[PDB]
Design an enzyme around this catalytic site. Structure first.
Site, PDB file in Angstrom:
ATOM      1  N   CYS A 263     115.823 -19.649 -49.109  1.00  0.00           N
ATOM      2  CA  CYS A 263     116.904 -20.482 -48.615  1.00  0.00           C
ATOM      3  C   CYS A 263     117.880 -21.045 -49.660  1.00  0.00           C
ATOM      4  CB  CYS A 263     116.497 -21.378 -47.408  1.00  0.00           C
ATOM      5  SG  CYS A 263     115.332 -22.757 -47.539  1.00  0.00           S
TER       6      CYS A 263
ATOM      7  N   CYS B  99     110.552 -22.285 -50.757  1.00  0.00           N
ATOM      8  CA  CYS B  99     110.669 -20.829 -50.616  1.00  0.00           C
ATOM      9  C   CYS B  99     111.920 -20.231 -51.277  1.00  0.00           C
ATOM     10  CB  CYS B  99     110.521 -20.378 -49.152  1.00  0.00           C
ATOM     11  SG  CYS B  99     112.036 -20.311 -48.164  1.00  0.00           S
TER      12      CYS B  99
ATOM     13  N   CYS C 126     112.450 -27.644 -49.272  1.00  0.00           N
ATOM     14  CA  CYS C 126     111.774 -26.379 -49.147  1.00  0.00           C
ATOM     15  C   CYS C 126     111.788 -25.556 -50.447  1.00  0.00           C
ATOM     16  CB  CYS C 126     112.348 -25.594 -47.984  1.00  0.00           C
ATOM     17  SG  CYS C 126     111.486 -24.044 -47.769  1.00  0.00           S
TER      18      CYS C 126
HETATM   19 ZN   LIG Z   1     113.109 -22.392 -48.182  1.00  0.00          ZN
END
Ligand SMILES: [Zn+2]
Ligand SMILES: [Zn+2]
Ligand SMILES: [Zn+2]
Ligand SMILES: [Zn+2]
EC number: 4.4.1.22
Lengths: 194, 196
Positions: A57, A54, A52
């Site tokens: 996180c 983004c 991921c």
């Molecule tokens: Zn993420």
């Protein structure tokens, strides 16, 4: 065509993707503290492991992507060290529980009963010493790595490396996950029957 | 020969039965609403860019259609000619304020009023509202999974995606990667994260 040498995604995938073990029954997640670590029992196999991109996180040191999977929330139990856990943002729709001393997100909880991902915790299975966890299936929020300082001109080689690892790059979630989310929204709104 | 059955899949009238191409040195035209008399008329005095079909729930779509077709033009090139009084803003709080004829329901343009937005200075236009050919052709499909929010059964998705790919409209559940990387580059440059 495109030159893919020296591209790092996340250390769990840089040498290729590790297979799941059939019949995997879960394991234990530990924060990075040398003493009094947070320990979480994950008592089921995970689903939808992915890398991921983004900004929200937890990534290991020097990693452009994080690796994050989902488990039913009944399968999760904080064994040792709950006092040491703090929420990274109580406003966030997914609430990240991070260790106070090493900054490692131990899980992410959805407290909103109406949120599409409710009933499902978000875990970083690299925090486990056991192998056999649900393998990374795709790459999510790929364009958002730019928002953490990746140079746009690096994007072609990043995506070309994701594809060679077998991880299809998306700028959101995978299409089956995005249809799942839209179905949930549409059933809540009345656009769809049920 | 073929792997997914795509028969019966309708996307948008403007792609279902042939996609009209761009024509050289196209310089623009006039968008009209669907009022039989005294329509809103808007001039678009440039060629558009980034025409795409879009599954989001906020864009205007002709009756029947599951996607809208929407393109982008510099706001400098866009002028309301007749019927400003028949227009109303759909949601003045959206990042894109869509101006829609209160009588026929057709959105005549979408304008970004936030100076910090990635697309500021670009209006959104449905060039199917022009009776001229020569507009930039749709290039991809955006917000594909979002058609479920308008009531398309999720069992339809695979046929719908296959059919988009047959038209050359790569389906994405957001915008296309170049547009997505541009939005990201914008956001990073403002936030500190990316230089100069
Ligand atoms: Zn993420
Ligand atoms: Zn710790
Ligand atoms: Zn009208
Ligand atoms: Zn749309």
């Amino acid at each position: 065509m495109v030159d893919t040498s020296g591209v790092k995604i996340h250390p769990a995938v840089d040498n290729g993707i590790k297979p799941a073990q059939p019949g995997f029954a879960g394991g234990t997640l530990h924060c990075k503290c040398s003493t009094n670590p947070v320990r979480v029992a994950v008592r089921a196999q995970t689903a939808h492991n992915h890398v991921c991109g983004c900004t929200k996180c937890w990534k290991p040191e020097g990693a452009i992507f994080s690796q994050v999977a989902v488990v039913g929330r009944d399968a999760l139990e904080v064994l040792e060290g709950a006092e040491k856990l703090e929420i990274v943002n109580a406003e966030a729709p997914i609430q990240r529980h991070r260790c106070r001393d090493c900054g490692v997100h131990m899980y992410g909880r959805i407290e909103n009963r109406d949120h599409p991902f409710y009933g499902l915790d978000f875990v970083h299975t690299e925090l486990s010493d056991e192998d056999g966890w649900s393998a990374p299936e795709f790459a999510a929020f790929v364009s958002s790595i730019i928002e953490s300082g990746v140079d746009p001109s690096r994007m072609e080689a990043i995506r070309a490396r994701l594809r060679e690892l077998g991880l299809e790059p998306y700028d959101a979630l995978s299409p089956p996950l995005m249809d799942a989310i839209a179905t949930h929204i549409a059933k809540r709104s009345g656009a769809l029957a049920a």
